[PDB]
């Protein structure tokens, strides 16, 4: 082997173990080949990360960084609905890191919390924008057109959801929950048993529309 | 029908354009082929309600009231023996609850027994058996529609044309064969 | 129940007649044909979604890399066949 | 009496539990 | 008071939003 084979983590075997092409008999090798190409563009920029630490602190947290965002921010924009403000309220009966934290904002502010929930949101989804950095960096061409752009422009409107309570109205917080649950796949493949034979079944509305 | 010709019809024009749509026109295939005969598979429930009226109406009749200036006076309804065909579609009236037209049963809780399992069961019926009943056919049209369809496929997209074989094996052992195609099987060269 | 928007017909059963079967046919038409039909390419949707899918997963996980070959009756009859994905079909060796 | 219809005296002891559920399941809706 | 039936004071300041909504979904109509 050569020396800088192993530096090549999970993320790859399972990737290229789902990059399918069956463009005839079987999904053999056009593919690998493709994948290989962009595989080893990828894999020397790693060594490129060697020279900046930071990078490599974020790297084994990124996973969790982007997690424990979602997490936390829901755990917010539900938050919203559940006690309006404006009225002085009581509370109204009516992972070893995070219990901590949600128990210390239990005793927040009855309103102050929820002003510091904002903030580590702005902040939480500005990690999960450097961990998407850490993950890909210097926009290393790619064959892949698709995919550069549709993940940052999902991770430019969760930093966009900061937005809508940075200092900005009530709500949304609930659209922030919606798409999270969205980035969640398998709920994504039932989802998707609803859009693929769906582009033009759109259409078979209005077929009752007019019938 | 707009020459000179009144309104409408236009509508009609709109309609079988979109007809002319294909995809639609397979979606909607998802309902006549295995249809022919499954018309007659409506009038099954039309029937299998069509007693049950009786088998109320015998130890039952409807005793029903309310659910010249205005066509609106006293509601002078109920049933001697025609109405009894009628009233089986305000019978079936929702997919909510069927029967269910005498309200105020006084609490003549035996008759109020007899009442409501009777009614229940024709709601259970004929609410649901039927109900997935009819449908059944509609769903196990896609479920047909698809399933020969890429059976179709395989014979050309999957399988060339004339050798009953499945093709690969052969190929991959052998010369060269990506541009079989071009000569040995090429069906516009037959033409050709 | 659809249509069912006038009420107090006042017994003039023919056209009760008329207003009744149309509407109906129309309940049975639109509700039935096409809910069941609306869905219908939603419920197909989950019939192919599958369907495809153990195909999918039958070329990697039921057959290995690249033979085009169903494995198994070669692989019983001879040498010791469990091995061969190490070193004759392994993909990330190609790339290595 | 004259009708059928009085001032709706219901209400359930613990026998008529297991009769509602149909009115309880009176609907799709 | 006597009876639990008054004049229906409802109408949903923010919260009663989140209730209204299965009786939004109330039916299969």
């Not at chain 1, 890191?97 to 210390?104: D, G, K, P, Q, W």
């Not at chain 2, 109320?56 to 006076?73: A, C, R, S, V």
């Not at chain 2, 496929?153 to 064969?177: A, M």
Request: charged share 20%; glycine share 6%; net charge neutral.
């Amino acid at each position: 082997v050569p020396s800088i084979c192993e530096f090549l983590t999970k993320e790859s075997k399972l990737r290229i173990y789902y990059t399918t092409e069956r463009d005839e008999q079987g999904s053999k090798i056009n593919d690998f080949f493709l994948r290989s190409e962009d595989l080893f563009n990828e894999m020397n920029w790693q060594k490129k990360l060697r020279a900046q630490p930071v990078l490599y602190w974020c790297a084994r947290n990124m996973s969790f960084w982007s997690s424990i965002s979602f997490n936390l921010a829901v755990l917010m924009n539900l938050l919203v609905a559940f006690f309006y403000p404006f009225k002085g309220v009581r509370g109204g009966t009516l992972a070893l890191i995070a219990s901590t934290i949600l128990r210390l904002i239990f005793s927040v502010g009855l309103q102050p919390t929820l002003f510091l929930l904002g903030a580590f949101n702005v902040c939480n989804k500005i990690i999960f924008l450097m961990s998407f950095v850490g993950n890909c960096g210097t926009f290393t061409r790619g064959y892949r057109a698709m995919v550069l752009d549709v993940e940052f422009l999902y991770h430019l409107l969760y930093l966009l959801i900061c937005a809508m309570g940075l200092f900005v109205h009530e709500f949304f917080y609930s659209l922030l929950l919606f798409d999270l649950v969205y980035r969640e796949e398998t709920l994504l493949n039932v989802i998707k048993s609803v859009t693929r034979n769906g582009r033009p079944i759109i259409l078979t509305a209005a077929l009752a529309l007019i019938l | 029908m707009g020459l000179f010709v009144h309104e409408f019809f236009y509508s009609l024009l709109l309609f079988d354009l979109v007809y002319r749509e294909e995809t639609l026109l397979n979606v909607i295939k998802s309902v006549t082929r295995n249809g022919r005969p499954i018309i007659l598979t409506a009038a099954l429930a039309l029937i299998l309600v069509y007693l049950f009226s009786i088998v109320g109406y015998l130890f039952f009749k409807d005793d029903f009231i309310l659910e010249e200036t205005e066509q609106d006076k006293e509601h002078t309804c109920e049933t001697l023996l025609m109405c009894i065909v009628t009233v089986l579609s305000h019978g079936l009236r929702s997919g909510g609850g069927v029967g269910d037209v005498l309200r105020k049963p006084s609490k003549e809780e035996p008759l109020f027994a007899a009442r409501v399992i009777y009614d229940l069961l024709f709601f259970f019926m004929v609410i649901i058996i039927v109900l997935n009943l009819i449908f059944g056919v509609i769903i196990d049209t896609f479920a047909d529609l698809r399933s020969e369809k890429q059976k179709k496929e395989e014979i050309l997209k999957t399988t060339c044309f004339i050798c009953g074989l499945e093709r690969d094996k052969f190929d991959n052992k052998t010369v060269t064969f990506e541009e079989h195609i071009k000569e040995e099987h090429n069906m516009w060269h037959y033409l050709c």
